[PDB]
Design an enzyme around this catalytic site. Structure first.
Site, PDB file in Angstrom:
ATOM      1  N   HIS B  41     -35.630 116.555 -10.746  1.00  0.00           N
ATOM      2  CA  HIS B  41     -36.846 116.179  -9.383  1.00  0.00           C
ATOM      3  C   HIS B  41     -35.594 115.581  -9.103  1.00  0.00           C
ATOM      4  CE1 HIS B  41     -36.903 112.843 -12.825  1.00  0.00           C
ATOM      5  NE2 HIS B  41     -37.016 112.304 -12.171  1.00  0.00           N
ATOM      6  N   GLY B 143     -34.608 104.516 -12.989  1.00  0.00           N
ATOM      7  CA  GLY B 143     -33.178 104.470 -13.061  1.00  0.00           C
ATOM      8  C   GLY B 143     -33.426 105.546 -14.453  1.00  0.00           C
ATOM      9  N   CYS B 145     -34.436 107.847 -15.797  1.00  0.00           N
ATOM     10  CA  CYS B 145     -34.647 109.781 -16.636  1.00  0.00           C
ATOM     11  C   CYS B 145     -33.567 110.180 -15.835  1.00  0.00           C
ATOM     12  CB  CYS B 145     -35.539 110.277 -14.788  1.00  0.00           C
ATOM     13  SG  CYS B 145     -36.739 109.814 -14.588  1.00  0.00           S
TER      14      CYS B 145
HETATM   15  C1  LIG Z   1     -37.805 108.614 -13.528  1.00  0.00           C
HETATM   16  O1  LIG Z   1     -37.299 110.273 -12.394  1.00  0.00           O
HETATM   17  C2  LIG Z   1     -36.265 107.756 -12.879  1.00  0.00           C
HETATM   18  O2  LIG Z   1     -35.822 107.120 -13.621  1.00  0.00           O
HETATM   19  N1  LIG Z   1     -36.074 107.665 -11.979  1.00  0.00           N
HETATM   20  C3  LIG Z   1     -34.433 107.187 -11.485  1.00  0.00           C
HETATM   21  C4  LIG Z   1     -38.557 107.537 -13.078  1.00  0.00           C
HETATM   22  C5  LIG Z   1     -38.675 107.028 -14.776  1.00  0.00           C
HETATM   23  C6  LIG Z   1     -40.002 106.557 -14.418  1.00  0.00           C
HETATM   24  C7  LIG Z   1     -40.734 105.726 -15.915  1.00  0.00           C
HETATM   25  C8  LIG Z   1     -39.775 104.460 -15.682  1.00  0.00           C
HETATM   26  F1  LIG Z   1     -40.650 106.821 -16.913  1.00  0.00           F
HETATM   27  N2  LIG Z   1     -39.811 108.660 -13.456  1.00  0.00           N
HETATM   28  C9  LIG Z   1     -40.932 109.466 -12.429  1.00  0.00           C
HETATM   29  O3  LIG Z   1     -41.139 108.242 -11.744  1.00  0.00           O
HETATM   30  C10 LIG Z   1     -42.059 110.895 -12.731  1.00  0.00           C
HETATM   31  C11 LIG Z   1     -40.915 111.585 -11.537  1.00  0.00           C
HETATM   32  C12 LIG Z   1     -40.737 112.677 -12.067  1.00  0.00           C
HETATM   33  C13 LIG Z   1     -41.646 113.732 -12.631  1.00  0.00           C
HETATM   34  C14 LIG Z   1     -43.062 113.091 -11.289  1.00  0.00           C
HETATM   35  C15 LIG Z   1     -43.149 111.682 -10.245  1.00  0.00           C
HETATM   36  C16 LIG Z   1     -43.590 110.957 -10.851  1.00  0.00           C
HETATM   37  N3  LIG Z   1     -43.146 109.792 -12.000  1.00  0.00           N
HETATM   38  C17 LIG Z   1     -44.022 109.667 -13.119  1.00  0.00           C
HETATM   39  O4  LIG Z   1     -42.881 109.185 -13.808  1.00  0.00           O
HETATM   40  C18 LIG Z   1     -44.805 108.961 -13.046  1.00  0.00           C
HETATM   41  N4  LIG Z   1     -46.006 109.394 -13.845  1.00  0.00           N
HETATM   42  C19 LIG Z   1     -47.148 110.145 -13.436  1.00  0.00           C
HETATM   43  O5  LIG Z   1     -47.228 111.015 -12.676  1.00  0.00           O
HETATM   44  O6  LIG Z   1     -47.619 110.792 -14.643  1.00  0.00           O
HETATM   45  C20 LIG Z   1     -48.545 111.439 -14.389  1.00  0.00           C
HETATM   46  C21 LIG Z   1     -45.150 107.460 -12.251  1.00  0.00           C
HETATM   47  C22 LIG Z   1     -44.568 106.694 -13.372  1.00  0.00           C
HETATM   48  C23 LIG Z   1     -44.245 106.942 -11.305  1.00  0.00           C
HETATM   49  C24 LIG Z   1     -47.002 107.208 -11.729  1.00  0.00           C
END
Ligand SMILES: *[C@](O)(C(=O)NC)[C@H](CC[C@H](C)F)NC(=O)[C@@H]1[C@H]2CCC[C@H]2CN1C(=O)[C@@H](NC(=O)OC)C(C)(C)C
Ligand SMILES: *[C@](O)(C(=O)NC)[C@H](CC[C@H](C)F)NC(=O)[C@@H]1[C@H]2CCC[C@H]2CN1C(=O)[C@@H](NC(=O)OC)C(C)(C)C
EC number: 3.4.19.12
Lengths: 305, 305
Positions: B41, B143, B145
């Site tokens: 992603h 951040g 991930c």
């Molecule tokens: C990483 O992508 C990241 O650190 N990016 C810079 C983040 C880490 C979030 C927390 C700290 F774990 N992850 C996301 O935001 C992921 C993202 C990639 C997969 C789908 C996208 C949404 N996501 C989420 O974690 C969401 N979770 C969710 O939808 O669960 C059903 C939320 C936390 C943003 C709502």
């Protein structure tokens, strides 16, 4: 989100760990530039231990008696001296992995990471606090002496602890890197008991703020308290007095959450007087006191090194 | 003595952490030999997230669109491919700090260390378990991930987890290093809830053995139980069934302490039915299930890497 007991990354310290052997005794040392620091009792047998004269034992050693190994490689010792309870072995090779570092004597209530090591090889890393009674609640087996405790600030490793002893009830005592013990303890096998410990109030409050930041809010009550009235309660439950300095140090977490410190103190007072009633806070069924305010901010803000 | 939640030394993994940026998105990657592994992603914006077509998004990227930085140094990308939920960026420089390593898909109930990282820089290290419901109870901020989980066996780093998402209630989901999620989860921002979790029975028993080794014996009763009768109780309290394999895996701790596994099961049954009555075990007021038998032996025997 989430909240874990989190240690500093250990790589910069791993690159400094060596084994020191003198006679029958092997323990760990810390190799920084061209000096290896280790506990002075490397020069003892386990009969010298009741009451060794370290100065006397050291006069009968010379450089070559110290076998220092960094991994597979012997480091030749070219000088030695004693500073309080630590030996400094000058070696003929500077450690190329030496990080930027300082030696710091930490205050009770502050936390640090311990890299537990055996025969100069790291086993694991965990976070501790310097208890108000100058012990630490560590995890150490025979062979771990000379393992160090440290904090990291960006690139700089502040070494604060070197492991020497275990006191009754499985708690630990040691020195700063100048060889001065924390607490009244001495490096001899004689009856010594820690003072009665106390709970680190400012750290409990910091951890309650961590809970709020993580959405675990159930214990917040509608009240406030004065600093003096809170401390009367803290005293009864064997909590350390909360000072205005502590209140100021909690400022960042108070500002982040919008909960004034003295309001959080009212919620803690209620927890002390009434208990948790079988509930948990951040997955714990007891009030946790080994996270500093800085630990909470670092972990909830993503500070890196 | 002592017992702490203890992570592996992180140095070998720290030397593999890099930052990967594509467009507006920056996260962490793992640099091993001439490949950087990171979550797919990285190629998304935070509007693609409801339901991205990753294959489609990737066809419109080329090598140069990926900015990979190892500390201060940009690494030139010379190939890329997608494997399940991870991207593999081939770079023109092999990482000279690459440790001996393997990729392993761990089983529920097993533990590992997480090196939490931001912008390619390590923040902290902590120990987790893969929960029976295929989540982990971590500590991650935006951040993080691409941060990885791992075990170390002597010199060999077994990477088992890469961080991707947070699910409701502050628990975490991710993939192995082949990009396959643990559990039913998908890398999109859509309603997904973990299954109901369960307590890892074999690990609770291991931790009771750790308590005995440390002299915290109060909960040992005079009774025994059959495996079947114990499991009837475990079921009621949302504990996973104990298998004969688990009994055999507990053999070393049983032999060390002289307490047969089924005798320890009788003591655990009593703890489940009656509670702790305000007492602690190894400083905890709850029964702990994130130490494996191997974790207990390693920590109580001083295994190094
Ligand atoms: C990483 O992508 C990241 O650190 N990016 C810079 C983040 C880490 C979030 C927390 C700290 F774990 N992850 C996301 O935001 C992921 C993202 C990639 C997969 C789908 C996208 C949404 N996501 C989420 O974690 C969401 N979770 C969710 O939808 O669960 C059903 C939320 C936390 C943003 C709502
Ligand atoms: C280190 O010296 C070591 O690892 N050597 C290889 C050990 C570590 C012991 C535990 C795991 F912490 N420490 C000692 O054995 C010290 C030793 C140096 C100072 C005085 C000598 C005794 N000692 C102890 O820790 C004793 N503590 C004691 O006397 O407390 C009052 C015990 C634990 C051996 C009784």
């Amino acid at each position: 989100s989430g909240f874990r007991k989190m240690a500093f990354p250990s790589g910069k310290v791993e690159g400094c760990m060596v084994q020191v052997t003198c006679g029958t005794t092997t323990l760990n040392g810390l190799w920084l530039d061209d000096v290896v620091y280790c506990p002075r009792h490397v020069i003892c047998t386990s009969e010298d231990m009741l009451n060794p004269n370290y100065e006397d034992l050291l006069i009968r050693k010379s450089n070559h008696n110290f076998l220092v190994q960094a991994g597979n490689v012997q480091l030749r010792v070219i000088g030695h001296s004693m500073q309080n309870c630590v030996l400094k072995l000058k070696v003929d090779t500077a450690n190329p992995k030496t990080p930027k570092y300082k030696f710091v004597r930490i205050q009770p209530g502050q936390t640090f990471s311990v890299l537990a090591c055996y025969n100069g090889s790291p086993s694991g890393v965990y976070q501790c606090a310097m208890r108000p009674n100058f012990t630490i609640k560590g995890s150490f087996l025979n062979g771990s002496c000379g393992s160090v405790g440290f904090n990291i600030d960006y690139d700089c490793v502040s070494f604060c602890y070197m492991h020497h002893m275990e006191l009754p009830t499985g708690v630990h005592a040691g020195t700063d890197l100048e060889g001065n013990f924390y607490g009244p303890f001495v490096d001899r096998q004689t009856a010594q008991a820690a003072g009665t410990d106390t709970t680190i109030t400012v750290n409990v409050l910091a951890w309650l703020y961590a809970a709020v930041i993580n959405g675990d809010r159930w214990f917040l009550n509608r009240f406030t308290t004065t600093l003096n009235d809170f401390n009367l309660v803290a005293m009864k439950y064997n909590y350390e007095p909360l000072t205005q300095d502590h209140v100021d140090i909690l400022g960042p977490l108070s500002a982040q959450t919008g909960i004034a410190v003295l309001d959080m103190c009212a919620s803690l007072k209620e927890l002390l007087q009434n208990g948790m009633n079988g509930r948990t806070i951040l997955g714990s069924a007891l009030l946790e006191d080994e996270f500093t305010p800085f630990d909470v901010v670092r972990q909830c803000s993503g500070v890196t090194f």
